[PDB]
Amino acid sequence: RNLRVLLDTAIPPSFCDTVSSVLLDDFNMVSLIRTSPADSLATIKQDNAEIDIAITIDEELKISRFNQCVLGYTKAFVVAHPQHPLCNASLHSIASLANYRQISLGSRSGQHSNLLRPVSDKVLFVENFDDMLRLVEAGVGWGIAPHYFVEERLRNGTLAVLSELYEPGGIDTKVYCYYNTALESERSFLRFLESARQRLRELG
Amino acid sequence: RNLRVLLDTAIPPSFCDTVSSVLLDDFNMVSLIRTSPADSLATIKQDNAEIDIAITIDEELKISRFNQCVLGYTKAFVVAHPQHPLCNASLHSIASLANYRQISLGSRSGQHSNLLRPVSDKVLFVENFDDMLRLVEAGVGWGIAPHYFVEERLRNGTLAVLSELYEPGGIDTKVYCYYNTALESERSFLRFLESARQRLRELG
Ligand SMILES: CC(C)Oc1ccc(-c2ncc(CNc3ccnc(C(F)(F)F)c3)cn2)cc1Cl
Ligand SMILES: CC(C)Oc1ccc(-c2ncc(CNc3ccnc(C(F)(F)F)c3)cn2)cc1Cl
């Protein structure tokens, strides 16, 4: 039968690399789908999408018709222009960053998870990290981005990090894997889980 | 828009690993499809399948509505049971292997490419390498298989190689990449080509 895997934008692509390497060996067709973390959960719930596996950071225990396991952790950072105001203060709190503009990830349904619910009251919603960064690089605000996006930008100084007194080394965020009940009865999935887990570990 | 990549069974899975790693970065949805090498070409020709990229070993310059490039080489071997008759003779020719039973890959359309057209006159068609090997291990005949299938079997002695005076180190077979004209105008594809090429090289 056909499979349809979903990976949110927070998960780096070299992960879907190793996901498809494994699943094809014991399948016919594997469809990889990318979505904003704000849209990931809402997508699988639609019975119309026939999503069989979802791999995202958003959290929910009330998801129905699916199950839930943990694959590992990804990494995120609070970034802002190097000359952005809050780099002068090595001691900026949540209530201090809530008074500036955040570049959040707006959802296509309007709902906002407790995960990606913006922190600031002055917010400017986007649908993807590429646009979140095009703004943050212009100094329009700050935002929380995956490590793989802000990796190059941080090394060459186009972009600085604000989240080091909060959590040194970046904000670790669980990657979860929702999966439809029927795949419980199958090896390859268990083989995929063990490989996906060892795959997210190697990214540290 | 949506993409649908096709990989034949002769190409190992860790290759579709690196194919999807690259394409997703600059796409929304990538669908990976596995097919017997005998069925690969016939599939893309069907305009009903909406195949956008095909990656197989079968050869044809008259393919219409597509283009054609070369990605690298895979490897194959002529294998047979270790106690199979033709291991006694270190000097078996094509006309000597044509008198025994071959386990070929039959096609769903009946047609047989000049590539996978069986060599022997006594042939037993299968649709996949797993069944080709279940027979060859039983000593029902010999067959031409990809390196990644007969890798473990050869190391632990469950299966021997007959194709070393023909071509030492295994029969190298070009992997090609057929691709629809519209993708000519795009970077990621050129980025995919250069990565897929360096990916098949690393498998040597
Ligand atoms: C420096 C300190 C004073 O400020 C902050 C520290 C931490 C947080 C913070 N909020 C939400 C979460 C939940 N997880 C994510 C939310 C959004 N996106 C992502 C990802 F980028 F991974 F996709 C992950 C994690 N951390 C917010 C602030 Cl403002
Ligand atoms: C030892 C010698 C005396 O015998 C032989 C030597 C070589 C050949 C031979 N024939 C066809 C081709 C074409 N390429 C493939 C055909 C089928 N399958 C595959 C793959 F496995 F890769 F998918 C590749 C290559 N080689 C046949 C014989 Cl009998």
Residue numbers in the entry:
A (entry chain A), B (entry chain A): 93 to 296
Sentences from the paper on this structure:
A promising target for QS inhibitors (QSI) in PA is Pseudomonas quinolone signaling receptor (PqsR), also called multiple virulence factor regulator (MvfR). PqsR is a transcriptional regulator that controls the Pseudomonas quinolone signaling (PQS) system and is considered as one of the master regulators of PA virulence. Activation of PqsR by its native agonist PQS leads to the direct and indirect transcriptional modulation of genes responsible for environmental adaptation, virulence factor expression, iron acquisition, redox signaling, antibiotic tolerance, cytotoxicity, and immune modulation/evasion. Herein, this work reports the rational design, optimization, and in‐depth profiling of a new class of Pseudomonas quinolone signaling receptor (PqsR) inverse agonists.
However, compound 24 was chosen as our frontrunner as it showed the best compromise in the biological activities together with suitable solubility. We solved the crystal structure of 24 in complex with PqsR at a resolution of 2.74 Å. Overall, the observed binding mode was in accordance with previously reported QSI bearing the trifluoromethylpyridine headgroup. Notably, the detected electron density confirmed a more planar conformation of the bi‐aryl ring system in 24. Upon binding to PqsR, both rings tilted about 24° as observed by the corresponding dihedral angle. In comparison to the values shown in Figure 2, this would translate to an angle of 156° between both ring systems, which is closer to 180° (full planarity) than 119°. Investigating the complex more closely revealed that the meta‐chloro substituent of the Eastern ring fills a small pocket near Ile186, while the isopropoxy group protrudes into a tunnel‐like cavity framed by Ile186 and Tyr258. We conclude that the planar conformation promotes this space‐filling mode‐of‐interaction, rendering the pyrimidine scaffold beneficial for achieving high affinity. The binding mode to PqsR was elucidated by an X‐ray cocrystal structure.
